[PDB]
Symmetry: C2
Subunit: 786 residues, 2 copies
């Protein structure tokens, strides 16, 4: 049955309004502070410079407690804003200072004072960032390949890494004091005359300095609270502020005991990670698993208050923001932080792990209705029916939540990559769809985006592009007599560019280790303290690197068109197709129609579905060949964030009939309007791809007309649709359930739809914050009925 | 028979005068240039910054050709001067700017303009030197131990490492082009997707840039020579300059063919090493072995011209200088560079290797009569009588040359340390007395000086010094009942301080690898190119670290006095001795007499000789426990440069009767005036020490009255003396043969004795350039007769 959802407290409505009414801006406090610290630590090893910088930032960064907050800790004075991280890159900011407020979507405000104060920042960091060192490590040939419009490694180049779920459970138990004591104990075990312990010693002392700074940070809020309380007339709020001061004072260094304490300490851990570095996809992961014990053992708290606290955490997760350069902003549209939080699933012994907090998380999504966190649910053979149905009820709300993940495929895929069965069973999701064992991994889950469609274009043009030979000079398409020769050339182009993408990633990897090893973050991930080395230096138990392929449906549809129309039926010659594509079908609409009418991916047609599979596998097999400086293996993923639109604008006409400059397909979803046989047939098609090899994750989007989810049958049908796709070995699926008229109305009168949330790809966003190009891509997606 | 020596050409007299008439100063060109370069390579890996800096320096450093020179290449405009190396340290220079010319010995001039230009240098390098990073890596306990007046690790802390004999022979054969080609071949062999090759690729390309810069440097002299030739009227000199231009143009990339070419290329290799870094002890080593082939195959050169060219090399070796801070200057007095050049010995087959150049080297020492190079000879069982007698003839000249080394102990000692028998047989000496296989070693042969006498002082005072517990709190001397308890405490004090000295050395080791890896030097030492790693990063086939113990005779004489006077005969109680030493024998000359009359080292008395041996072994055994960051073992040495005087000034009264502040003994030589049984008895005593374990070398000084070497009998006696010491496993021996009246006269009227040369310890120096304290220590040494 459909029970519906409860109503959130007025407090939640007030806090939510603070987020939406905010005017996202760029603040300079952090930038000024890290610059000041580095100027004083020139003769110190990088790890200590990082620890002392975090200390200086945490001791002097402005503190803020917003009205009516129960959970405190704000990274910026203005809500939903961003600090600056000049240690990674900053010249892009220097260039865009005067046009940040002129953007359509993802606009940021910045004061004249901030622009002025940043001048010295740009001056000091010149040549001292991770981005600049990364480029120096790259060969000239790699630099050229990086700038050929085939792939981008900008994510970890311009900003921090992130993409990790730390051991939140451990810190909640032992507190910052517990971590410090573990570091001190290791220091004693390491007492030795062996030279190798010299650097380990510096790392362990850097962890101590960092955690001591965290304790100081929390204490500043404890003092701030009392200060505000003493100046508060309202007895109720005054009592609240005094309780906050009390909780902050305890969890400043000690572990949590009660649920309120666990919630507040959780946020401080999460918040401070975001102060040390701006890598995104800092994912809470299995929140329901590590938070439940505190809820269950709290014999005084009521469910209503426990739920209100969770709602507050949901709101806080929407307070964090991150400014990016104008190009990268096209890759990550809608002020996204990608903080994935997942509930449900099984435990290490293979038994169901659903609990009370699992359901409270689902409830919170409806109470708050904001883009973050990226709520997800794990599904397996023994998922309780009531759990899946409750998730279905949430999907009916039209927030794009929750994302569904398949334990049956993910667990085996992870064990295949080296995780123990116990660790694989305890997986959580990073960012959009990247799985990992929390607290034991440095996965680099979004190290790059690779345009698969461009490889098809370069195959047809023999590596020649814009009157320049950017790729290998493979066999001239005009001379090919078989589809086999085509696939060989395709593989040759793929091989060349994947090689340089992975090499570029490795250079950026080395740069982060050399200039930005992270003491605080590393202390909360296994073996780092025990090994006496940072995450950047390979301290994690598990190490990977994960680059994404974009354009799967376009490749399958293009490959089958080439094979059928050109080589099998000989309707047109290779020369004719090459010329038609290079002219964007000008005066050859009859040829384009032939291509458009060829079999399309997403209709359960094996002929094309198997080519989408093989086309993607060529990319995946190349990625698997590489290893990173941390001794880990590269693993491919197939998701696009919002880059399918941008990549499309840089891609010429393709054999599937798509015109030049048009968006590519998102994730492994069928191309727009191509899936005309119903959602089940579409699911069947997508399930044919190899979701096991793409262990960094694959993303499948489906959009339903609201009528499809109506009533109990609607929930039953969605549930059946999901189970069938997962039984067929699909990796992930998520759904948009909205009235198309509402999206169109939002474009015309944004002001009237500030709270409208929509699913982009692996994350949801405030529709009006998205660039029109992305809004239109979402509106153009196929709309299904059950 | 005494052959006598030939007379050098007038040209040699003119060139020699340029050295002696020069006014040693500090120039700023190099410092300004390296600063310019580093400011432009901030985003480059350290190895490339080093290669690009060398390139900038070599392309823009002033070039100078001195009048009448046949071999060209000057590091400074003024002869016998020094450039500045701010990358290692510079604040000491900033502090001493106005008192460098107020020094008595080792004085340096510096223009007001240079002082002005260095202001920006000091500003830029603040916190960016190797010295500052080294301190950061040291623990607080180590920093304190380093400043307790027990040992010093300043050599590699304030300046470059050096202490190496590169593969001169290889470069003479293949030229800089050959080295570049080898790096390019390795680059091709390394083509791979493995991330580990990224850093190797940068190293190899740095070698290429560095060697290409070397070629450019040589071509600059080629052009300069021709320019000077065009403004030279004298036909003879004009032809000389045109020949120089011709030779430089060839060896500017190609290997040498003629002897003149080999001599010029040799100097360029040596000179450029001294531009990249200022570590001293850059030693030519077996010059006679790699230069002889070019002499023998040169069918046109006359012996007189070949000799004149060698004489020119000798003078060029005296043109290089290095300014050091006030304190360090006390450790290395007399403008020393310690460039050891050795001749004679056996080859890898175990056959004698004496040749014509071996003899021309001995002749050159008499033709030039300057402090450099530090000429040495190898002696073994089958050394030709003619060779040893010729070396004896040179000793009679009274220049302190040559130093004699014993193959019979050195070869086994080296194999014991890991060298193959073939490599050990091909050893050369580094600096003062440190053996190594040239072209395959990174030995850090003078990483520290350790005051052994202070350990005795601290044993008596239970680690308490200057009202502070600086060492371990060992058993109170007053409560000791046996000499065994004393020796146990002695070992405990030794253990503590040696541990921190080696740890401090390792921190400096890491700092050099992190901030000053050397591309040029590394290219000429084996496995570096093949391994794709610098010398600082462990690329050498053989790796070691070598700290020196100072005060051997003082320890032996002190230990036997404690054992006999206190514990054996009970003449005085431990308390009485402790009090008298702390009072520097004030009002207790009867007790000092007792100590002075105890058996002394150097008289062939086993009771004391065995304690000098055991005392030194306690130090040696502690040093052997350590390893460096390059995977090599520490090996002890027993030599003092000129630091025995300075160390003595920091040491209180000792049990041997020596008063507070007096100089300590030099190397393993007996204390002044203590060896009263003749030189043979002295040699017998010294031979009882373990010269095999002290593989970093031991130094033995003896001084004879001129009458002792008179006539053929004198030479025969000196020869017999040396062979007897070596047959007993002595490591090295050298002799001063001069009239004491001459030394005293030189102190009263310096300008009258500008060309007077004297042996200090492992090196000879212009007597008048030495501080009076060092002059007096030399004058006070025991004077023997056969």
């Amino acid at each position: 049955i459909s029970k519906g959802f409860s109503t959130q407290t007025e407090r939640i409505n007030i806090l939510k309004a603070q987020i939406l009414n905010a005017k996202p801006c760029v603040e300079s406090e952090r930038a000024i502070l890290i610059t000041e610290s580095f100027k004083q630590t020139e003769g110190q090893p990088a790890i200590l410079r990082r620890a002392l910088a975090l200390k200086h930032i945490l001791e002097n960064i402005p503190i803020t407690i917003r009205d009516q907050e129960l959970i405190v800790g704000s990274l910026t004075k203005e809500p939903r804003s961003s600090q600056v991280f000049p240690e990674f890159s900053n010249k892009w900011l220097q260039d865009e200072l005067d046009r940040l407020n002129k953007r359509t979507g993802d606009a940021f405000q910045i004061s004249e004072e901030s622009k002025e104060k940043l001048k010295d920042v740009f001056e000091y960091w010149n040549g001292k960032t991770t981005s600049e060192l990364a480029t120096s490590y790259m060969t000239e040939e790699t630099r050229e390949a990086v700038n050929c419009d085939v792939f981008t490694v900008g994510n970890y180049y311009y900003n921090g890494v992130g993409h990790v779920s730390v051991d939140y459970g451990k810190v909640l138990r032992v507190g910052f004091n517990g971590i410090i004591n573990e570091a001190k104990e290791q220091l004693e075990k390491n007492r030795s005359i062996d030279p190798d312990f010299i650097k380990k010693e510096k790392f362990l002392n850097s962890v101590i300095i960092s955690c001591e700074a965290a304790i100081t940070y929390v204490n500043r809020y404890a003092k701030k609270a009392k200060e505000i309380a003493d100046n508060t007339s309202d007895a109720k709020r005054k009592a609240e502020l005094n309780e906050i001061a009390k909780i902050c004072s305890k969890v400043s260094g000690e572990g949590a005991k009660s649920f309120y304490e666990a919630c507040q300490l959780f946020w401080f851990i999460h918040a401070i990670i975001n102060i040390e570095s701006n890598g995104h996809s800092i994912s809470p992961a299995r929140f329901d698993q590590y938070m439940y014990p505190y809820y269950e053992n709290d014999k005084n708290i009521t469910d209503k208050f426990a739920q209100e606290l969770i709602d507050c955490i949901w709101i806080k997760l929407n307070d964090i923001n991150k400014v990016r350069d104008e190009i990268s902003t096209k890759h990550f549209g809608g002020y996204p932080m990608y903080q994935n939080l997942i509930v449900g699933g099984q435990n290490s012994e293979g038994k169901d792990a659903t609990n009370k907090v699992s359901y409270m998380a689902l409830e919170a999504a409806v109470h708050v209705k904001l883009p973050q966190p990226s709520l997800s649910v794990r599904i397996w053979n023994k998922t309780p029916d009531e759990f899946l149905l409750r998730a279905a009820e949430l999907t009916r709300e039209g927030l794009g939540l929750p994302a569904y993940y398949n334990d049956e495929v993910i667990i085996p895929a992870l064990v295949s990559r080296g995780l123990t069965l116990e660790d694989a069973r305890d997986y959580g999701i990073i960012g959009c769809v990247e799985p990992q064992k929390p607290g034991k991994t440095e996965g680099w889950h979004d190290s790059a985006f690779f345009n698969l469609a461009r490889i098809v274009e370069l195959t047809i043009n023999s590596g020649f592009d814009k009157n320049k030979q950017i790729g290998p000079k493979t066999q001239n398409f005009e001379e090919m007599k078989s589809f086999d020769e085509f696939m060989k050339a395709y593989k040759a182009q793929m091989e060349y560019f994947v090689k340089h993408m992975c090499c570029a990633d490795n250079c950026i990897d080395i740069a982060h280790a050399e200039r930005a090893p992270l003491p605080f973050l590393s202390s909360m991930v296994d073996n780092c303290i025990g090994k006496g080395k940072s995450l950047q230096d390979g301290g994690a138990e598990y190490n990977f690197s994960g680059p994404q392929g974009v354009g799967v449906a376009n490749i399958g549809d293009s490959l089958v068109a080439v094979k059928k129309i050109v080589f099998d039926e000989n309707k047109i010659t290779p020369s004719e197709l090459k010329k038609t594509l290079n002219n964007d079908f000008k005066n050859s609409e009859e040829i384009q129609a032939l291509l458009k009418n060829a079999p399309k991916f997403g209709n359960d047609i094996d002929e094309v579905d198997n080519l989408a599979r093989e086309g993607a596998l060529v990319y995946c097999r190349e990625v698997n060949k590489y290893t990173n400086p941390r001794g880990g293996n590269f693993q491919p993923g197939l998701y696009p964030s919002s880059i399918n639109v941008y990549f499309g604008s840089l891609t010429g006409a393709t054999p599937d009939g798509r015109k030049s400059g048009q968006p590519l397909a998102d994730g492994v979803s069928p191309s727009r309007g191509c899936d005309v046989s119903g959602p089940t047939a579409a699911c069947n098609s997508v399930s044919k791809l190899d979701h096991f090899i793409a262990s960094n994750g694959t993303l499948f989007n489906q959009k339903f007309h609201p009528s499809a989810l109506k009533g109990d049958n609607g929930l039953m049908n969605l549930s059946s649709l999901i189970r069938s796709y997962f039984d067929q070995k699909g990796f992930h699926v998520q759904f948009n359930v909205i009235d198309k008229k509402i999206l169109l109305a939002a474009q015309k009168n944004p002001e009237k739809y500030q709270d409208l949330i929509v699913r982009v790809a692996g994350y949801s966003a405030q529709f009006i914050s998205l660039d029109k190009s992305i809004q239109n891509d979402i509106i153009a997606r196929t709309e299904h009925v059950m």
